[PDB]
Structures are given as structure tokens and as C-alpha cells.
Amino acid sequence: SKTKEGVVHGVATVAEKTKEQVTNVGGAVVTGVTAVAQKTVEGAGSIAAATGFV
Amino acid sequence: SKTKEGVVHGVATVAEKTKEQVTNVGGAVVTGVTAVAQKTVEGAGSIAAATGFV
Amino acid sequence: SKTKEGVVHGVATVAEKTKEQVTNVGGAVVTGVTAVAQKTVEGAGSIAAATGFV
């Protein structure tokens, strides 16, 4: 009854004068992940994952 | 009863004068992921994932 | 009863003077993903995924 899994609610965000600069050369960059949710039953659940080379 | 999986609600966002600059050279860049949700039963669930080379 | 999977609701967004600049040279860039949801039963569910080369 009233089960809740991986939930995000009641989020208030204010950004006035944010300045974000990203310079990438042959890699991986993850920025600005806000108010996200997921649900993985049989598998790998990654949020904001970065890998450079294999 | 009233089950909830991977849910995002009640999100209020204000951005006034945001400045975002991204320069990429042969890689991967993920920016600005907001208010996202998913549900994977049999598989890999990735949100904002970055890989450069294989 | 009242099951809910991968849902996004009640989102209010205001952007006043956002400035976004992206320069890409032979890679992958994902920006500005807002209010998205999915549902994968048998497979890989990726949201805002970036790969450069294979």
C-alpha cells in the first residue's frame, strides 16, 4: 500500500546567472543532471556515468 | 495499491541568465538533463551516459 | 490499482535569457533534455547517451 520506488518530487530550483564552460578533447564529460530517477529490475542502472576509452 | 516506480513530479525550475558553452573535439558531452525518468525491466538503463571511444 | 511507471508530471519551467553555444568536431553532444520518460521491457533504455567512435 502506497509503495514508492525511486521517486523525486517537490523540487524547486532557481538559477540566476550561472556560467558553465566545458572543453573536451577525446574523453567524456557529464554535467548538470538534476531531478532524475529510474528503476532497473535486471540490469546495470547508471546515472551520469562517464568512461573515456576502451 | 497506489504503486509508483521511477516518477518525477512537482518540479518548478527558473533560469534567469544562464550561459552554457561546450567545445568538443572527438569525444562525448552530456549537459543539462532535467526532470527525466525511466523504467527498465530486462536491460541496462543509463541516463546521461558518455563514452569516448571503443 | 493506480500503478504508475516512469512518469513525469507537474513540471513548471521558466527560462528568461539562456544562452547555449555548442561547437562539435567529430564527436557527440547531447544538451537540454527536459521532462522525458520511457518504459523498456526487454532492451536497453538509454536517455541522453553519447558515444564518440566505434
Place this chain on the structure above:
Amino acid sequence: SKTKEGVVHGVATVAEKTKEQVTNVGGAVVTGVTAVAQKTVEGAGSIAAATGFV
């Protein structure tokens, strides 16, 4: 009863003076994905996915 899968509702968006510039040279760029949803039963469900070369 009242099942809900991969749903986005109740979204209010205001953009006043947004400026978006994208320069691409032989790659992949995905920007501005808002209020999207899907449902994949047997397959790979990707939203805003970017690959450069194979």
C-alpha cells in the same frame, strides 16, 4: 486499474529570449528535447542518443 506507463503531463514551459547556437563538423548533436515519452516492449529504446562514427 488506472495503469500508467511512460507518461508526461502537466508541463508548463516559458522561454523568453533563449539563444541557441550549434556548430557541427562531422559528428552528432542533439539539443532541446522536451516533454517526450515512449514505450518499447522488445527492443532498445533510446531518447536523444548521439553517435559520431562507426
Place this chain on the structure above:
Amino acid sequence: SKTKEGVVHGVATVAEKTKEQVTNVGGAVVTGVTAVAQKTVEGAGSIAAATGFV
């Protein structure tokens, strides 16, 4: 009863003075995907996917 799969409703969008510029040279660019939904039973369901070369 009242099943709902991959649905987007109740979306209000206002854009006042948006300026979007895209310059592409031999690649792939996807911009401005709003209020979309789909349903794939046996296949790969991609929304706003970009590939450069094969």
C-alpha cells in the same frame, strides 16, 4: 481499465523571442523535439537520434 502507454498531455508552451542557429557540415543535427510520444512492440524505438557516418 484506463490503461495508458506512452502518452503526453496537458502541455502549455510559450516562446517569446527564441533564436536558434545551426550550422552543419557532413554530420547530423537534431534540435527542438517537443511533445512527442510513440509505442514500439517489436523493434527499436528511437526519438531524436543522431548518427554521423557508417
Place this chain on the structure above:
Amino acid sequence: SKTKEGVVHGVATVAEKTKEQVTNVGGAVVTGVTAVAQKTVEGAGSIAAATGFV
């Protein structure tokens, strides 16, 4: 130059399942005034004003 007096713009409103009930007996009731504007030069400017008796 570019003068602006009493202006309302860029309003996005979503109402899903609002229920409003008003019972009045010999008075005055004002409800639900949204996105209104006026301009009075020589006079009394009232918005959503209620008086019962005189």
C-alpha cells in the same frame, strides 16, 4: 522608447482536475481571475473587487 505599462505576457497555465464550488447567499464572490491587465488614467481601477451591500 519601448515603454510598457500594465502588461502581462509569457503565461503558461495547466489545470488538470480542478474542482471549484461556490455557494453565495446575498453577497459578492469573485474567483479565478487570471492574466488580466488594465490602464486607468483618471479614475479608480479595481480588479476583482467585491462589495456586499450599500
Place this chain on the structure above:
Amino acid sequence: SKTKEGVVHGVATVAEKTKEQVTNVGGAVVTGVTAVAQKTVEGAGSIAAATGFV
């Protein structure tokens, strides 16, 4: 230059399941005034004013 008087803009509002009940007996009731603006030069400017008797 670019003067602005009594202005409301960039308002995003979402109401999901609001329930409002008003019972009045010989008075004055003002509810739900949203996103309003005015401009009075020579006079009394009242917004959502309530008087019962005179």
C-alpha cells in the same frame, strides 16, 4: 528607454487536483487572483479588495 511599469511575465503555473470551496452569506469573498497587473495614474488602484457592508 525600455521603461517598464506594472508588468508580469514569464509565469508558468501547474495545478493538478486543486479543490476550492467557498460558502458566503452576505459578505465578500475574493479567491484565486493570478498574473494580474494594472496602472493607475490619478485614482485608487485596488487588486482583490473585499468590503462587506457600508
Place this chain on the structure above:
Amino acid sequence: SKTKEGVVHGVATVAEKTKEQVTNVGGAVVTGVTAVAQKTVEGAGSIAAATGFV
């Protein structure tokens, strides 16, 4: 240059399940005044003012 008087902008509001009940008997009630602005040059400027009797 760029003068601004009595201005409200960049407001994001989400209300999920608000319940408001008002019972009035021969008085004055003002509720729910959101995102309002005015400009009075020569006069009394009242916002959400309540008087019972005179």
C-alpha cells in the same frame, strides 16, 4: 535606461493536491493572490485588502 517599476517575472508554480475551504458570514475574505503587480501615481494602492464593515 532599463527602468523597471513594480514588476513580477520568472515565476514557476506547481500545486499538486491543494484543498482550500472558506466559510464567510458577513465579512470579507481574500485568499490566493499570486503574481500580481501594480503602479499607482496619485492614489492609494491596495493589494488583497479586506474590510468588514463601515
Place this chain on the structure above:
Amino acid sequence: SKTKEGVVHGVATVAEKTKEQVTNVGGAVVTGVTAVAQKTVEGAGSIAAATGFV
């Protein structure tokens, strides 16, 4: 240059399950005044003022 008088901006508000009950008998009640602004040059500027009798 860039003068600003009586201004409210960048407000994000989320209300989930608020319950408000007001019972009035021959008086004055003011509740829920959010994100308001004004500008009075020659006069009395009152916001959310309550008087019972005169």
C-alpha cells in the same frame, strides 16, 4: 541605468498537499499572498491589510 523598484523575480514554488481552512464571522481574513509587488508614488501602499470594523 538599470534601475529596479519593487520587483519580484526568480520565484519557484511547489505545494504538494496543502490544506487551508478559514472560517470568518463578521471580520476580515487575508491568506496566501505570494509573489506580489507594487509602486505607490503619492499615497498609502498596503499589501494584505485587514481591518475589521469602523
Place this chain on the structure above:
Amino acid sequence: SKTKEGVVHGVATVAEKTKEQVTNVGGAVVTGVTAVAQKTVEGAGSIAAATGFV
């Protein structure tokens, strides 16, 4: 240069399960005044003022 008088900005508010009850009998009640601003040049500027009788 960049003068600022009576300004409220950058306000993020979340209310989950607030319960407010007001019972009034021939007086004055002011509750819940949030994110308000004004500017009075020649006059009495009152915010959330309550008087019972005169």
C-alpha cells in the same frame, strides 16, 4: 548605476503537507505572506497589517 530598491529574487519554496486553520470572529487575521515587495515614496507602506476595530 544598477540601483535596486525593495527587491525579492531567487526564492525557492517547497511545502509538502502544510495544514493551516484560521477561525476569526469580528477581528482581523493575516497569514501566509511570501515573496512580496513594494515602494512607497510619499505615504505609509504597510505589509501584512491587521487592525481590529476603530
